[PDB]
Design an enzyme around this catalytic site. Structure first.
Site: not given
Length: 106
Positions: A30, A33
């Protein structure tokens, strides 16, 4: 400083914790993230004493996320007294995180 949470230690580290806990749900793949990870490290310093920051890798701990209706990452949940007090989905700047934190910590 930043709690390493797992499917096994969630209930005790978060649900039975006494104070404000900010949980970061991420995964290695991700990008957004990995973009806010630095910001969490700094937030842990500026909010030492009034906030505890923890992180849960969903790939390695695929059970907790579903129970909390987490539909995607990055997603941050602010637990208070053993229950979700505030939610925030998506990446955000340093400023947006502080304003969000200041407003829900009072």
């Amino acid at each position: 400083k930043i709690i390493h949470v797992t499917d096994d230690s969630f209930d005790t580290d978060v649900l039975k914790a006494d104070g404000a806990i900010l949980v970061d749900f991420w995964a290695e793949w991700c990008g957004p993230c990995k973009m806010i990870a630095p910001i969490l490290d700094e937030i842990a310093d500026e909010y030492q004493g009034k906030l505890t920051v923890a992180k849960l890798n969903i790939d390695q701990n695929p059970g907790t996320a579903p129970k909390y209706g987490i539909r995607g990452i990055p997603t941050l949940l602010l637990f208070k007294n053993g229950e979700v007090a505030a939610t925030k989905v998506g990446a955000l700047s340093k400023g947006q995180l502080k304003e969000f934190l200041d407003a829900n910590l009072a």
